Paper text:
The room temperature X-ray crystal structure of the tmMBP complexed with maltotetraose was determined at 1.70 Å with an Rwork/Rfree of 14.1/17.5%. The final room temperature neutron structure was determined to a resolution of 2.10 Å and refined to an Rwork/Rfree of 24.3/27.3%. Importantly, the neutron structure also resolves the position and orientation of D2O solvent molecules within the substrate binding cavity, which were previously inferred to provide hydrogen bonding interactions in the earlier cryogenic X-ray model. The tmMBP binding site uses a network of polar amino acids to satisfy the hydrogen bonding potential of many of the maltotetraose hydroxyl groups. The water molecules bound in the specificity subsite are responsible for forming 3 of 8 hydrogen bonds and are thus important in binding of saccharides in tmMBP.
Members of the PBP superfamily mediate the uptake and transmembrane transport of a diversity of metabolically important solutes in bacteria, such as carbohydrates, ions, amino acids, and polyamines, to name a few. Despite the wide variation in PBP ligand size and chemical functionality the two domain PBPs have a conserved αβ-fold, with each domain encompassing a central β-stranded core that is sandwiched between surrounding α-helices. Ligand binding at the interdomain interface induces a hinge-bending motion in which the two solvent exposed polar interfaces of each domain close down on and envelop ligands in a largely desolvated binding site reminiscent of the protein interior.
Author numbering: 5 to 382
Write the structure that this text describes.
């Protein structure tokens, strides 16, 4: 009789502290295990059917459909505190008419900049590119003017979607997963802006999340694209940072980031589901508990009465502005192959191995082929 939780490095300390509180009040020990974020879903897909998955996992709402149709996460029954959560957060964790998690936070990326190098936020992507090149020259390559995880579709989406790409078409009958918008004229235009930044040398093909995040924390990157999950580490590193929406792609044409929702899901195969349900609906979901989570992991709260406490914080203001321009990630099982296909296309594009139009058409054909083959069933 023990509850086990898998989560990323950002939640481990606070969830272990809250787990000791739950042990004091209910008598049940809680063990929190770090698992790298990019492996949680894959490890759970192989472990849970074997009886070796955690009771509770913490992660992003795009996973919900794939996990639900494979029978691996438990629906959450209605409970009266749900009226206090934002509908956008509850819809993101809903699939097939059922709620499949308790959300704790919403998030989007934004432009994060180091005020020691950036005095005026660029208003357009053209101005950002010019400012990055000036920094690159001024400090002789010791400081990067602009860097981000370029070949990760999650981080490059604001440019693709902003110009009119889309993942699946919205219809009155739901998402049409045969109508994929990732190689339309808008997607091409957004992918060409990415290529232009490579060609002009402000990004490189080797740029990745770890080097971005490390360089910013060391004071050697002026401008990055990242989310609220990183800001505490940058405050703790003593960086004098600011946050703004991603600059418009052209005048009057905004970037359009994904919106994500982070949340708690229960393993349907757990022998401890009954206690896991109490933990989530009668302890984690409470206003006081959700505010403690915010203090340790300061993303946008999913409960309105907690957001109300922190709504004046300038980081909350800026990231709310970014998220307001965004679109929630789809959560249908068919999202699963999209990330790999688009990551491969972006790698090809930035390495000059194919034209933008060709690389995106190949990506869409590969996604269609995976959907047709039922790759999302395990
Ligand atoms: O096939 C490639 C990979 O595809 C899938 O990964 C997706 C995720 O499912 C998406 O949710 C998204 O991931 C974002 C994530 O939403 C966002 O929060 C952020 O993640 C933070 C994390 O919240 C934080 O706690 C800490 O751990 O830092 C993470 C950032 O390093 O950024 C993620 C993007 O990197 O997009 C990815 C695709 O990149 C699939 O689940 C994977 O298993 C698969 O490998």
């Amino acid at each position: 009789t023990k509850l086990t939780i898998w989560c990323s490095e950002k939640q481990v300390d606070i969830l272990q502290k809250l787990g000791e509180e739950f042990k004091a009040k209910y008598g049940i020990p809680v063990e929190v295990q770090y698992v790298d974020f990019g492996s949680i879903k894959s490890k759970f897909l192989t472990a849970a059917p074997q009886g070796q998955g955690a009771d509770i996992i913490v992660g992003a709402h795009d996973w919900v459909g794939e996990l639900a149709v494979n029978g691996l996460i438990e629906p959450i029954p209605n409970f009266s505190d749900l009226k206090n959560f934002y509908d956008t957060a509850l819809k993101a964790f809903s699939y097939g008419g059922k709620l499949y998690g308790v959300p704790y936070a919403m998030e989007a990326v934004a432009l994060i900049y180091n005020k020691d190098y950036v005095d005026s936020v660029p208003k357009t992507m053209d101005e950002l590119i010019e400012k990055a090149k000036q920094i690159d020259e001024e400090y002789g390559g010791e400081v990067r003017g602009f860097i981000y995880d370029v070949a990760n579709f999650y981080f490059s989406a604001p440019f693709i979607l902003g110009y009119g790409g889309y993942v699946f078409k919205e219809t009155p009958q739901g998402l049409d997963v045969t109508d994929i918008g990732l190689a339309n004229e808008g997607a091409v235009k957004g992918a060409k802006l990415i290529k232009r930044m490579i060609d002009e040398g402000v990004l490189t093909p080797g740029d990745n999340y770890g080097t971005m995040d490390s360089m910013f924390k060391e004071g050697l990157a002026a401008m990055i694209i990242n989310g609220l999950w990183a800001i505490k580490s940058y405050k703790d590193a003593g960086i004098n940072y600011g946050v703004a929406p991603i600059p418009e792609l052209e005048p009057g044409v905004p970037a359009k980031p994904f919106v994500g929702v982070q949340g708690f899901m229960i393993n349907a195969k757990s022998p401890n589901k009954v206690i896991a349900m109490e933990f989530l609906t009668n302890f984690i979901a409470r206003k006081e508990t959700m505010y403690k989570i915010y203090l340790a992991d300061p993303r946008l709260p999913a409960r309105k009465d907690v957001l109300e406490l922190v709504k004046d914080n300038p980081d909350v203001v800026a990231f709310t502005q970014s998220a307001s321009m965004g679109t929630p990630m789809p959560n249908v099982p068919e999202m699963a192959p999209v990330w790999s296909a688009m990551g491969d296309a972006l790698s090809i594009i930035i390495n000059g191995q194919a034209s933008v139009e060709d690389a995106l058409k190949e990506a869409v054909e590969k996604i269609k082929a995976q959907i047709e083959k039922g790759s999302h069933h395990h």
